[PDB]
């Protein structure tokens, strides 16, 4: 019930890219958490009004005591300092509680306090914190405010025999976002010792272990349920992928609980510094095994593995960690039943900025991952495409075709090199007969004076659309033998030299076998099919290679700038015919994920548009956001359109394969465009990754010295262009002008000034 | 048949005048998409070294080289253990470890390969059978690829020894101080370089054959930087994104990005010289 | 050491120096450098252009750019002295 | 002597002309 | 018919966008900002050019 496959060497880039992204995000997040933890370490030793407990209820109190105060309430919790006063807690030594406690909820039960001293004390009981409404009014200035003792029952709202409910609610409210590992890298309570950074190590350990376990199960266990393979459709049954995700998460959970237990309660003297090492091994091993088991995935289970990993991550975030914190709270409540679970205020905005950067980083990394998948999901049938197109160009004698001018050697060319290429013993299986759609114009051309061409082609007119007969025009009885064959609205725009062409014109099927096709070719040659105006010829058939699984649209074009001379151009476009009805292939998943990101960016833009109101125009940020959204939406829509068009064309073909053509060319166009756009989109992201390099004190100048000198560079470019247009208005240059290294002096001066202004 | 995918032809020659075997291998590859791809390899091995006095001279120099590398590794272990620990913030000691590692790898390869010559003896038993010299040529190539990098670093290390007057010392100071800040711009420039590389690979990497591979894209960009490649084929490859890419690359990374390197060096040298000149107004 | 047997442009030693000088003028071939040694050849080519056109040829200009300004300043001050 | 020692004096002259123009303009407009 | 006149068409589109930007920018200088103040010889060119 196990197998060591090692079948092939063709690596699967999906797992490698996912692992690389998951480690890079961990590295950068740890870099941020380093400073976010150094701030807390320095701070190791409004929310409401000015709390004031200045009282003189007692005397002769030359001792010390600690008065802890807890600001209860959801999303806000913080302790308080000791009972230090103005005269060392002595007679009438009580000051206002002006302690930094930024945690305070709304009109909720934000009241909790306790006292701990060296045994007992005199009748020195400060009344309460007299803070009603001065800054935020988290509560009113009214309480019991009388004599008390140790462990004061400071209950409130806006014996205690029922310790159970109170203990459970307090423990849950304190640990519902601290023990929960996932969203705890933001809400770590101060004065703790869990270090604020190894929390990220636990998260990366979970991610890598999930990836490794899922990669092992997919393509390493197919004996017990042999349900995988050809009988397993990659489409999510919603009964199976979730199940394997859940079982993987459950089985991997205990080692996480062991490594966390070794982390928590370690200062156990110094074992924490060992634990990191363990992690830096295990994740690597996990990545390693992925890089060994994922190399031989069939091309359909890769999306299933991603879905399983996502489900596994979402499972351990929607109840498993809450279950752990709940059981911990019950264990604490039922075991030992513990009863207690401008100078220096600028740092608040720094912490807010760091939290914002940390939150945006995850979205950036997810977007980078999804666009990397959309780009390089099939970055293995890419060199094969180049080899296939080169081979097709070579065996068609492209050089011999690109060097013909007269409109007479075309027939010997086709009869000698093309027809033997189409037919034969085996001879490169074709998947489709050829076609000879042809345009006439009806606006008879005349030869130019002696000389090949003076400037360009000209004398265009209205393309003919009528019907004709053998030879040419003679409709006598009924429909013409050479019908117009009206153009389809999908598949056109070859964009030749003289004009932009379309898929309309008079066609020829060019037979099926070599003998009949050759005879018909000669028959139409002698009857003057191609000697008249006949702007274009448009020979284009097909190609398909089963070994790699790639189709190729081949198009040959001879164009007539003048009667007697031609111009040759060929285009071989390789692509992969992936239908939309093929299930949940990776391009479809990436397309439906990119639309969600586009919608998110649009929502985030409108939420600020309507918050600031209108006239937010004239800001570069809005234009940049609205162009990024448009680019993402265009990419997704073009990919989806290509997927739909492929299915449409394939169905049309399989309908009438014997004697149809079906012109797959349009698909080859869209597959190109959908591959270009994404290639640009990723580019933008990469450029952004350069700019965010400015978050280093030493390297922040490289952006300032380039944003400051922009007007000068534009002025120099303006000088260049005006001298360039002058150079032609009197009727090299660019080289000599660019050899001046003009921008260098401006950049040097700006750099010197910025460095001088940096100290 | 149609199923074949590769063909090899192998032989070797002696050329008894000088003492140098020459092994010849010819490969022909048949891709599944059709076509033929040839390749060749001629390797001048030497296996009967000890004939002339110069050979004994070379052996003696090899022994002395082993003694020298042993001396260096001993004096490096002594320094790492019996002196300052974690002395890696120098770049003058991180160079010694590289040199000694490369040298010991070269010596290990030489001991592995030179001591392995029994195939020659087997051929000399009966000389009507194909000799198997393929492994020896591979290991000779690997040994050359290591020695050629070892000598480079040995030559590079000489820069430590040139501070014998004011001018060389100040040039060294300028060159060292200008490395801490050039590092950031180098990273930010290589990021954009790789962005262009991947864009070109994705767009033109199917019909140009100069962009047919990522490293080929990098080499093509470097050649364009030198000023060697012209876009006379890119328009045929693509007319929309071809000239746009070419113009943007040749404008942003040859008129703007490439001058920050000049600016940083110019400013660093100026401030260093000014500081060293002011160092005389106090004395 | 790497290309001194099969390119024919690095056969002798001085030939290597002259070939590098021609590379400085932008006259590289690269059709044989990459096929004579697929690894360690392109590495040499790439690390040679980054350490010459970016670093080591921007240092002569820096010295000649600083000294010219310094000498003009001193000479103008002396003339106005 | 043509690419290293003689080409760069031209660039130095251009650089000095730019710097002098900048300094003179700054002095005039800040006077 | 050419591969250069399309660049000219793109430049014309960019020019139309720039004119839209300058016309959507000038109306605010008369409505929100104090109006009937053109004795500057600078607000004069801004409107006549548009
Ligand atoms: C405000 C300040 C900072 O304190 C920024 C400095 C910007 C400034 C150097 C820039 C802004 C526009 C540029 C000119 C261009 O518009 C057309 C030309 C014509 C050409 O024949 C020669 C060159 C020249 C004059 C340009 C000279 C430099 C200029 C004046």
Give me the DSSP letters along A90-122: -TT-------------SSS----EEEEESS--S
Q: How was this structure determined?
A: cryo-EM
Q: Return the SS3 of B22.
A: strand
A708 lines ligand 1 (CB under 6 A): no
Element (H, E) at B28: strand B21-29
Token match 């600031």: residue?
A612
Spatial distance between the Cα atoms of A198 and A30, rounded to a whole number of angstroms = 9
A676 lines ligand 1 (CB under 6 A): no
A724 lines ligand 1 (CB under 6 A): no
A to D contact (≥3 Cβ pairs closer than 8 Å): yes
Spatial distance between the Cα atoms of A382 and B209, rounded to a whole number of angstroms = 12
Annotated resolution, angstroms:
3.4
CB contact under 8 A, D12 and C72: no
A718 lines ligand 1 (CB under 6 A): yes
Angle at B246 between CA B240 and CA B247, to 5 degrees: 95
Alpha helices in chain B (DSSP H): 53-82, 94-114, 118-125, 134-156, 166-177, 179-203, 214-226, 234-237, 241-252, 257-282
Pairing type for strands A550-562 and A565-575 reads antiparallel
The backbone torsions φ and ψ at residue B165, rounded to the nearest 5 degrees and listed phi first, read -160, 180
Are A667 and A544 contacting, i.e. CB atoms less than 8 angstroms apart? Answer: no
Beta bridge partners of A552: A574
Distance A715 CA to ligand 1 centre (A): 5
Distance A713 CA to ligand 1 centre (A): 9
Give binding residues of C as ranges: 25
A696 lies within 8 A of chain B by CB: yes
CB contact under 8 A, C40 and B148: yes
Enter the tokens of residue B143: 């040994």
Please report all neighbours of C, defined by 3+ CB atom pairs within 8 A. B, D
Give me the DSSP letters along A433-501: -----B---SS---PPSSSS-SS------PPP-S-B-SSS----SSS-SB------SSS-----SSS--
Enter the tokens of residue A469: 């007969």
Instruction: Please report, for residues A248, B15, D23, D24, D25, the alpha-carbon distance to residue D31 in angstroms, rounded to integers and kept in the order given.
Output: 77, 86, 12, 11, 10
Give binding residues of C for Ca(2+) as ranges: 25
- Counting ligand 1 atoms within 8 A of each CB, the residue from A711, A740, A747 with the most, and so the one to mutate, is A711
Token match 């999303």: residue?
A75
CB contact under 8 A, D12 and C61: yes
Residue A415: exposure state from Cβ atoms within 10 A (0-12, 13-18, ≥19): middle
Give me the DSSP letters along A529-586: SSSSS--B--EE---EETTTTEEEEEEEEEEEEETTEEEEEEEEEEE----GGG-S-H
CB atoms within 10 A of CB A202: 20
Maximum alpha-carbon separation in chain C: 66
C65 lies within 8 A of chain D by CB: yes
Query: On the CB side of A136, how many CA atoms lie within 13 Å of its CA?
Result: 13
Spatial distance between the Cα atoms of A251 and A242, rounded to a whole number of angstroms = 14
Are B106 and B150 contacting, i.e. CB atoms less than 8 angstroms apart? Answer: yes
Distance D16 CA to ligand 1 centre (A): 17
Residues in chain A: 759
What does the DSSP 8-state code read for residue A189?
A: P
C-alpha closest to that of A522 among A430, A505, A467, A530:
A530
**Signed CA dihedral, A167, A171, A172, A174: sign only:** positive
A385 lies within 8 A of chain B by CB: yes
Residue of chain A nearest E2, judged by CA positions:
A497
What does the DSSP 8-state code read for residue E36?
A: S
Residues in chain D: 31
Are A15 and A294 contacting, i.e. CB atoms less than 8 angstroms apart? Answer: yes
Pairing type for strands B37-45 and B21-29 reads antiparallel
Angle at B131 between CA B127 and CA B134, to 5 degrees: 165
CB contact under 8 A, C26 and B227: yes
C-alpha closest to that of C6 among B58, B27, B141:
B141
Q: What residues contact residue B188 under an 8 Å CB cut-off, 6+ apart? A: A690, A693, A699, A702
Angle at A43 between CA A42 and CA A46, to 5 degrees: 150
Residue of chain E nearest A458, judged by CA positions:
E1
Element (H, E) at B37: strand B37-45
C-alpha closest to that of A382 among A13, A684, A634, A666:
A13
Are A663 and A491 contacting, i.e. CB atoms less than 8 angstroms apart? Answer: yes
Q: What residues contact residue A486 under an 8 Å CB cut-off, 6+ apart? A: A504
Q: How far is A698 from chain D (nearest CA, A)?
A: 26
C-alpha closest to that of A511 among A524, A520, A502, A523:
A520
Beta bridge partners of A570: A556
Q: What residues contact residue B179 under an 8 Å CB cut-off, 6+ apart? A: none
Spatial distance between the Cα atoms of B132 and B47, rounded to a whole number of angstroms = 13
CB contact under 8 A, A742 and D14: yes
A711 lines ligand 1 (CB under 6 A): yes
C-alpha closest to that of C8 among C25, C27, C26, C33:
C33
Asked whether residue B142 is marked as a ligand-binding residue, the answer is yes
C-alpha closest to that of A199 among A213, A191, A188, A215:
A188
Q: How far is C61 from chain D (nearest CA, A)?
A: 5
Maximum alpha-carbon separation in chain D: 44
Distance D21 CA to ligand 1 centre (A): 12
């Amino acid at each position: 019930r196990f197998v060591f496959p090692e079948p092939t060497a063709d690596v699967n880039y999906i797992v490698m890219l996912t692992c690389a992204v998951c480690l890079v995000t961990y590295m950068v997040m740890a870099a941020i958490l380093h400073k976010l933890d150094q701030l807390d370490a320095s701070r190791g030793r409004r929310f409401k009004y000015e709390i004031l407990v200045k009282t003189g209820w007692g005397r002769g109190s030359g001792t010390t005591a600690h008065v802890g105060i807890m600001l209860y309430g959801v999303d806000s919790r913080s302790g308080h300092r000791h009972l230090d006063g103005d005269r060392a807690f002595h007679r009438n030594s009580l000051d206002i509680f002006r302690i930094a406690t930024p945690h305070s909820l709304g009109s909720v039960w934000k009241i909790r306090v306790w006292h701990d001293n060296k045994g007992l004390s005199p009748a020195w009981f400060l009344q309460h914190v007299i803070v009603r409404d001065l800054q935020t009014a988290r509560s009113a200035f009214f309480l019991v405010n009388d004599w008390l003792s140790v462990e004061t029952e400071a209950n409130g709202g806006l014996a205690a025999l029922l310790r159970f409910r109170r203990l459970l609610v307090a423990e849950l409210q304190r640990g519902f976002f601290d023990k929960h590992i996932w969203l705890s890298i933001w809400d770590r309570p101060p004065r703790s010792r869990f270090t604020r950074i190894q929390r990220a190590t636990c998260c990366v350990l979970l991610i890598c272990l999930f990836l490794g376990a899922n990669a092992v199960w997919y393509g390493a266990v197919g004996d017990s349920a042999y349900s995988t393979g050809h009988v397993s459709r990659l489409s999510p049954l919603s009964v199976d992928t979730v199940a394997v995700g859940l079982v993987s998460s459950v089985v991997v959970y205990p080692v996480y609980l062991a490594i966390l237990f070794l982390f928590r309660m370690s200062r156990p003297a110094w074992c924490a510094s060992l634990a990191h090492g363990l992690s830096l091994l295990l994740v690597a091993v996990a990545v390693a095994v992925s890089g060994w088991v994922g190399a031989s995935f069939p091309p359909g289970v890769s999306v299933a593995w991603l879905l399983s990993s996502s489900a596994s991550f979402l499972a351990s975030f929607l109840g498993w960690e809450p279950l752990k914190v709940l059981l911990e709270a019950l264990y604490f409540s039922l075991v030992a039943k513990r009863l207690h679970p401008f100078l220096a205020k600028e740092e608040a905005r720094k912490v807010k900025r760091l939290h914002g950067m940390l939150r945006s980083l995850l979205v950036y990394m997810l977007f980078l991952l999804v666009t990397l998948l959309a780009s390089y999901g099939d970055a293995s049938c890419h060199g094969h495409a180049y080899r296939l197109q080169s081979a097709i160009k070579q065996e068609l004698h492209s050089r011999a075709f690109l060097a013909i001018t007269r409109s007479e050697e075309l027939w010997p060319w086709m009869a000698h090199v093309l027809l033997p290429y189409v037919h034969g013993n085996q001879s490169s299986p074709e998947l489709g007969p050829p076609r000879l759609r042809q345009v006439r114009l009806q606006e008879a051309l005349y030869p130019d004076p002696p000389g090949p061409r003076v400037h360009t082609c000209s004398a265009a007119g209205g393309f003919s659309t009528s019907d004709y007969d053998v030879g040419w025009e003679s409709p006598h009885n009924g429909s013409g033998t050479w019908a117009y064959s009206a153009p389809d609205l999908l598949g056109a725009w070859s964009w030749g030299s003289c004009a932009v062409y379309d898929s309309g014109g008079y066609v020829q099927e060019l037979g099926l076998s070599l003998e009949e096709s050759r005879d018909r070719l000669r028959f139409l040659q002698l009857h003057n099919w191609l000697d008249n105006r006949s702007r274009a010829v448009f020979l284009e058939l097909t190609r398909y290679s089963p070994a790699v699984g790639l189709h190729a649209a081949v198009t040959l074009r001879l164009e007539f700038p003048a009667a007697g001379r031609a111009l040759a151009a060929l285009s071989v476009r390789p692509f992969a015919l992936r239908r939309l009805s093929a299930g949940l292939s990776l391009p479809l998943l990436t397309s439906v994920c990119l639309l969600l990101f586009a919608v998110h960016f649009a929502v985030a833009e409108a939420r600020t548009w309507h918050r600031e109101g209108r006239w937010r125009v004239l800001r570069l940020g809005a234009w940049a956001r609205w162009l990024l959204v448009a680019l993402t939406a265009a990419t997704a829509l073009v990919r989806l359109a290509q997927l739909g068009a492929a299915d449409r064309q394939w169905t049309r073909f399989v309908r009438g394969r014997p004697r149809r053509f079906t012109s797959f060319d349009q698909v080859a166009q869209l597959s190109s465009a959908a591959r270009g756009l994404a290639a640009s989109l990723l580019f933008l992201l990469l450029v952004k990754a350069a700019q965010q390099l400015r978050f280093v004190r030493q390297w922040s100048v490289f952006g300032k010295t380039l944003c400051r000198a922009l007007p000068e560079l534009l002025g120099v470019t303006l000088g260049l262009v005006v001298l360039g247009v002058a150079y032609a208005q009197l009727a090299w240059a660019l080289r000599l002008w660019g050899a001046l290294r003009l921008g260098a002096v401006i950049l040097r001066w700006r750099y010197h000034a910025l460095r001088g202004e940096l100290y | 048949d149609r199923g074949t995918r590769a063909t090899f032809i192998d032989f070797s020659v002696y050329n008894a005048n000088i003492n140098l075997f020459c092994v010849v291998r010819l490969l022909v590859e048949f891709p599944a998409t059709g076509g033929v791809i040839p390749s060749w390899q001629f390797q001048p091995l030497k296996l009967i070294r000890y004939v002339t006095t110069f050979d004994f001279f070379l052996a003696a120099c090899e022994i002395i080289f082993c003694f020298f590398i042993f001396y260096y590794v001993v004096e490096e272990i002594l320094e790492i253990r019996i002196h300052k620990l974690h002395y890696f913030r120098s770049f003058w000691n991180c160079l010694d470890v590289v040199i000694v590692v490369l040298s010991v790898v070269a010596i290990g390869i030489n001991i592995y390969r030179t001591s392995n010559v029994e195939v020659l003896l087997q051929f000399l038993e009966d000389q009507n059978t194909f000799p198997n010299f393929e492994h020896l040529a591979y290991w000779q190539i690997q040994f050359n690829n290591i020695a050629a990098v070892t000598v480079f670093f040995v030559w590079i290390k000489l820069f430590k020894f040139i501070n014998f007057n004011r001018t060389m010392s100040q040039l060294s100071t300028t060159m060292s101080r200008c490395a801490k800040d050039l590092f950031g711009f180098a990273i930010m420039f290589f990021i954009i370089f790789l962005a262009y590389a991947q864009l070109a690979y994705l767009v033109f990497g199917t019909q140009v054959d100069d962009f047919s591979t990522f490293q080929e894209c990098i080499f093509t960009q470097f050649r364009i930087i030198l000023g060697d490649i012209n876009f006379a084929e890119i328009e045929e490859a693509n007319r929309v994104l071809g000239p746009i890419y070419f113009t943007t690359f040749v404008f942003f990374m040859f008129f703007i990005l490439l001058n920050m390197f000049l600016a940083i060096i110019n400013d660093t040298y100026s401030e260093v010289k000014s500081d060293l000149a002011q160092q005389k107004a106090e004395m």
